[PDB]
């Protein structure tokens, strides 16, 4: 399985070639998304009793 092993190796090369980013900006984006749709999200804060159609 030398050929398949080399194909796996080149797949690892392709995975390594990607350009990564820093964790801080990713966490900032996650934080921004969390608070951007806070009002729309109906499970963080229970919606008005009449608003919820599951009553």
């Amino acid at each position: 399985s030398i050929a398949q092993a080399r194909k796996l190796v080149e797949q690892l090369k392709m995975e390594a070639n990607i350009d990564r980013i820093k964790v801080s900006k990713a966490a900032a984006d996650l934080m921004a998304y969390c608070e951007a749709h806070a009002k729309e999200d109906p499970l963080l804060t229970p919606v008005p009793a009449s608003e919820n159609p599951f009553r």
Binding site: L8, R20, F54
Partner: protein, 337 residues
């Protein structure tokens, strides 16, 4: 082969050191300024009951009103949570279905399991009777998970260590995804339907691409089989649940884990993982016959959902985000909210 092993080892070392350089701090270390979410109080508003055996998998519909449940009795019932009334009770030739999926258009429902076939039952028919539109087949293992990109394509996990992108109209694997050394337990599609993640028994998760058919990125870290996998609502990050009793959040852009939801009290494998509408929370059903509502940015038990006596096999948040649902081996599917 030996030279291949050496170069693979050193290349993985470059990958790890690149991630370490990119890993300045953890998510909790950076977002400690955030206030705690609070007490997430949820109760069983409704209980879809009527199945005859373990409910393996469920998929909330795009309507967020109709939800499929696949059950080992050999059933796919489409339930209407707004009315508790069943709409279709699609029988199964194969009793062993471990994946059921609802198409975004709502016209078809997919089921699969030990039969090694992904059957696409048709919901909207002129006659009104559900029948097999297409029995996608060609795998040599059980289909653990399958989802719809659209009304004519479907990405299916399987037990032959190969994911596939089946075409409904024709029935051939347009693109095949190989590279896992074990059964691919779960997969999820990104909201843009261009990328999708998949976690396998090889203790590995991947970001398989549906266009170039290559593993864009490979995320690891789990110490056991990854039973569940999801996405952040933006699609830029995702969370995995392992038999290691751990849920780990991996970010696509950062190419490394962000936070590990785990605790000494919680020792049991995760069976299904899903987020909320805004992604603040993390809803994960565990083997402790319960569900744990964590905070995504803090890894704290914001709440516990209790009421299933057997294991919570399947979990799903509504497409809009109204309520979350848990289907257990108790042969019942509750609708938490």
């Amino acid at each position: 082969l030996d030279q291949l092993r050496q170069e693979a080892e050193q290349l993985k070392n470059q990958i790890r050191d690149a991630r370490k350089a990119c890993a300045d701090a953890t998510l909790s270390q950076i977002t400690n300024n955030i206030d705690p979410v609070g007490r997430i109080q949820m109760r069983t508003r409704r209980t879809l009951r009527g199945h005859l055996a373990k409910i393996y998998a469920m998929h909330w519909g795009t309507d967020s009103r109709l939800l499929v449940s696949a059950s080992q009795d050999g059933k796919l019932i489409i339930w209407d949570s707004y009315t508790t009334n069943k709409v279709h009770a699609i029988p199964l030739r194969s009793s062993w279905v471990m994946t059921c999926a609802y198409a975004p258009s709502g016209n078809y429902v997919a089921c699969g399991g030990l039969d090694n076939i992904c059957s696409i039952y048709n919901l909207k028919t002129r006659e009104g009777n559900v029948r097999v539109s297409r029995e996608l087949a060609g795998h040599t293992g059980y289909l653990s998970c399958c989802r719809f990109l659209d009304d004519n394509q479907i990405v299916t996990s399987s037990g032959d260590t190969t994911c596939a992108l089946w075409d409904i109209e024709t029935g051939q694997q347009t693109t095949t995804f190989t590279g896992h050394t074990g059964d691919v337990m779960s997969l999820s599609l990104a909201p843009d339907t261009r990328l999708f993640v998949s976690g396998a028994c090889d203790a590995s998760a991947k970001l398989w691409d549906v266009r170039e058919g290559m593993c864009r990125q490979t995320f690891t870290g789990h110490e056991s089989d990854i039973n569940a996998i999801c996405f952040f609502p933006n699609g830029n990050a995702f969370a995995t649940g392992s038999d290691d009793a751990t849920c780990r959040l991996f970010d696509l852009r950062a190419d490394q884990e962000l936070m590990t939801y785990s605790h000494d009290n919680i020792i049991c494998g995760i069976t299904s993982v899903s987020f909320s509408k805004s992604g603040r929370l993390l809803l994960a059903g565990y083997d402790d016959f319960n569900c744990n509502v964590w905070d995504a940015l803090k890894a704290d038990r914001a709440g516990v959902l209790a009421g299933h006596d057997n294991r919570v096999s399947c979990l799903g948040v509504t497409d809009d985000g109204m309520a979350v649902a848990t289907g257990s081996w108790d042969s019942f599917l509750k609708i938490w909210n």
